[PDB]
Design a protein around this ligand. Structure first.
Ligand code: HEM
Ligand code: HEM
Lengths: 507, 507, 128
């Protein structure tokens, strides 16, 4: 009854057999029209870009090319299989308009299927592990797909695994089908028909290697099968995060931790779709190097790719040392950075997970990074009320030779800060009159900072707020059971002042 | 000295003059190579997709086509002008490797220039208004660009406006240049050379209308100029958010509020680059309709576009009522949803801003949405300790006919929940032994929910956590100055149970 | 029933605490978890006014020390049949917790206090 994903493959493919015996319906890469009737046709024909800086940093000699699969409609390499699966199910007559699609997946296939359903009108229910980022959840919500989260540490064949939940949901919902990516032949077939043909046409046939991360296994299986059928000289390199058992031989998989922060790759079972026989070698990868390489890719090549691309490049820079000049290597970058915006892209999260250490972050910063804000020539001899009139503020600011002053009330509550030039511009434009209160022109937001903080902290703060107020806090008492507090401003600092101080110190 | 952005244009262009008299260096859309040497070449050749559902919902009769400019390298329509500006400055000899680029912009151009600098090695300093989302800030940080935020309510010519800060930074940093988008002729020229040619080639020349949002003005100015030089029959429709003064005639701009949540479009000044004479009509737009139309686009067409595209489509569905069958309309979608992930894409933020009302959210939900969780057949007659052994939990769970039970300690602290099937699978796989504690298999996360909450709240919760524990809280006292608290679990609910209840109620 | 009180607690303490949280009645339970009964604010006030008790006195003089233990699974018909004998019925649940699965432990965990008043109010609300 239950079609488990760990069953051995029933296929009989082997090298050299002509395509005419294939039981599957093969289609060549279609030529895109002048205008595509629907967004679903914007899948495929992705570019192959040359890597320039990451390779030389590690002494790589071969031409390293990256398959930017994050430019697809859904921003992932899992839009191909979604489209192919939907098309095959529709052509088989299994799926009709208004039917329900249940897919246990890691979100990328879920996003692709949600997009397909929104375009074509299906009820899409997505079952995914809990550890996936909330970005995918939000995008799915906007696409009108129903989400079901499942525990991360649940064994694949357990009752509450993502596949198990999806299967029992299919068992109980009427007119519901599962296009299971772990077992459907359409998954590897999509790559076999489009991804491999695209690669061979774009690279002019000649290449010596290919590196691809492994989830469901189609992304590597189809490409490897087509390449070995056409260009067997290519070495197929697989990747697998620590804690997963996809990589072989087995002793490579002996590790204590079963959970990893990297997403979209690695599983505790061997998929039925996967064909490990066409894999020339396997590598293990960890979160730290993967995210670091993803950040390096973003910062030095402009490829806005996710963690899996980082893992792929980290493994490639190791595996491809054997290659010499004139030989070509290819890497498959699954998805975009969009799915990981608050994840590894955030320095906060990296430091919280420990994947980045303060020494690694600070060793490359300028010489003024560790200096305190105390080193600045900050000052703020005066302040004004928020109810004060505009012309009054103008005249008083000129009375004492300042162009800006903090705004504070009688109770000591800081309201913001106002600048002379902005007030003058507002008066000239007629937006305010001298008798009007400064509330129309006041800058009512700022960041409260302390003298003890370094200039690096100030720089990190100024990326969010223009003005930072250097303040101190004193607490005064009447019997030591009767407390009172107040804060007591010093000067107004901006990136302008910081850079002026840096320039003055340099000269 | 200071080149203000509000100065009138010095150009002398007028209809019908041949290109040979142009002082500018024009280049036709280049043919992409088989493999692009660097990612910067992945700008242009974007697809034009047909809109199908948004048009008919409002009775639109014309063929509505959207220019998906969010597929560019930087995911925005502001990668074109960045590339063109960099190329023109390099070809003019103004910019050398290692030079500093300062750009006051709304982030999209900043992101494009940061990508260009990362590829080519420039010091990129980005000055933007504060109201921009943190997504752009994070992406810029990953690209190695220095960010400076400026107040939103600062007048454009004020000392601390984004343009003013950028100009004075250029004034004080050595070897620093500004490629100002508000004044550089390259901005509109990029569209005039590529965007318009792409549109005319893709649509086979025939089209009757064009709708485009307006920021710097190039996105509309260049396309309109080329179209009127080649296909004058097209009606050029501009858009402008409330609070901005770009739209004409003036009385359209009379509104109380000067600040709007929409980003990337609308300014308090007329850019020097903008040519309003080639605009056939203008429209005003507001945040609510813009974000609603963006969400509708995402949910019904799969176009992962931002708020500006929503504004453009909202204005188009109004302006294009005059068109009849057989005529074609074009809309320019600036950027991707990536820049607005935690913004309007989030229902929380929409409700907080009031752009969505609870009645509008609830009127379309199922009939069971308002029912309390109290209507379920939930139960949890037993619980177990976390230190208990695996085999003990197995035997006891079978002793009483349950397959799952919450995990709680002596003190009353809830640790999680464990399922029989997962424990059996772990034992079979050898990951645990009967004597081992349940800590290796326990699901140590969940969401605490109350009986009073509706099933809609439970559904929203289950999109994040698989298991939700229905608990109650009682507080007990010894003298009414001596308090004590405890919580007291009821049953374990999942989307499985919710959907089973829905099915049972339906039948 | 968000709160409960001890049986040894004083009368004035129960008065003040009941007003502290806007309830007029609360179940009475001890430290061991044994349910003793339930006490109402109005009856306590009447007893204080009549002089039968003082604020420092324990609630034992005014507590309603009898009730019927009922389960969520039971129908309103069963509740109506029960209320013909006892005024108050306590909706409780029972959970049993274990340390090695040979070491059992039990406890019950009250939900709310129901009477014919509440039943008829629910019926009226549903009818309208
Ligand atoms: C070229 C000649 C091929 C032959 C003779 C062949 C043979 C078969 C057959 C007979 C099945 C059906 C097994 C069943 O229903 O029990 C099957 C399924 C399948 N085929 Fe092929 N195949 C060919 C090509 C390919 C290619 C090119 C791919 C991928 C690149 C592929 C991937 C698969 C997969 C993943 C399945 C599903 C196996 C399962 O569900 O157990 N096949 N194959
Ligand atoms: C086709 C014949 C054209 C002529 C004779 C012409 C004329 C000129 C001249 C002489 C300037 C320099 C003004 C100065 O430096 O003071 C200029 C600048 C400029 N041109 Fe053109 N132009 C032509 C085409 C175009 C086109 C096709 C576009 C855009 C689609 C364009 C947009 C601009 C802009 C934005 C400026 C900057 C104006 C300023 O900075 O004040 N021009 N034009």
């Amino acid at each position: 009854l239950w079609i488990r994903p760990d069953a051995p493959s029933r296929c009989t493919w082997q090298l050299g057999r002509p395509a005419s015996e294939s039981p599957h319906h093969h289609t060549a890469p279609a030529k895109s029209p002048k205008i595509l009737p629907d967004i679903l046709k914007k899948i495929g024909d992705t570019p192959m870009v040359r890597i320039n800086k990451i390779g030389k940093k590690f002494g790589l000699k071969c031409e390293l090319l990256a398959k930017c699969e994050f430019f697809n409609a859904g921003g992932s390499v899992k839009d191909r299989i979604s489209l192919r699966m939907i098309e095959d199910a529709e052509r088989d007559g299994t799926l009709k308009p208004g039917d329900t699609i249940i897919e246990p997946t890691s979100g990328n296939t879920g996003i692709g299927l949600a997009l397909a359903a929104a375009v074509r009108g299906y009820r899409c229910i997505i079952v995914m592990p809990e550890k996936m980022s909330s970005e995918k959840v939000d995008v799915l919500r906007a696409l009108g797909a129903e989400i079901v989260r499942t525990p991360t540490n649940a064994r694949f064949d357990s009752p509450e695994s993502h596949v198990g939940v999806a299967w029992r949901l299919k068992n109980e919902i009427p007119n519901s089908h599962i296009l299971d990516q772990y077992r459907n032949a359409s998954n590897p077939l999509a790559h076999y028909d489009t991804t491999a043909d695209e690669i061979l046409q774009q690279c002019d046939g000649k290449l010596d290697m290919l590196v691809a991360s492994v989830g469901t296994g189609g992304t590597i299986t189809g490409i490897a099968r087509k390449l070995k059928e056409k260009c067997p000289g290519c070495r197929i390199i697989g990747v697998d995060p620590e804690g997963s058992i996809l990589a072989e031989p087995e002793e490579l998989n002996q590790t204590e931790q079963t959970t990893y922060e990297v997403e979209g790759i690695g599983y505790d079972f061997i998929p039925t779709v996967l064909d490990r026989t066409v894999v020339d070698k396997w590598f293990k990868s960890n979160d730290e190097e993967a995210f670091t390489f993803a950040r390096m890719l973003i910062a030095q090549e402009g490829l806005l790719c996710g963690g899996s691309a980082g893992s792929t490049v980290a493994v490639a820079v190791k595996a491809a040392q054997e290659l010499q000049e004139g030989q070509r290597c290819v890497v498959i970058l699954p998805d975009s950075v969009r799915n990981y915006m608050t994840k590894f892209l955030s320095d906060r999260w990296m430091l919280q997970k420990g994947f980045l250490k303060e020494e690694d972050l600070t060793e490359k910063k300028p010489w003024w990074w560790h200096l305190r804000v105390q080193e600045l020539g900050l000052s703020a001899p005066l302040t004004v009320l928020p109810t004060i009139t505009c012309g009054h503020t103008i005249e008083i600011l000129r009375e004492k030779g300042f162009d800006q002053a903090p705004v504070v009330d009688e109770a000591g509550v800081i309201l913001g800060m106002v600048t002379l030039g902005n007030m003058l511009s507002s008066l000239l434009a007629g937006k305010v009159q001298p008798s009007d209160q400064v509330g129309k022109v006041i800058y009512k937001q700022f960041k409260q900072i302390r003298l003890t903080d370094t200039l690096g902290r100030l720089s990190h703060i100024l990326e969010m707020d223009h003005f930072a107020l250097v303040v101190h806090e004193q607490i005064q008492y009447h019997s030591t059971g009767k407390s009172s507090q107040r804060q007591m401003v010093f000067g107004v600092v901006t990136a302008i002042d910081l850079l002026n101080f840096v320039a003055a110190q340099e000269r």
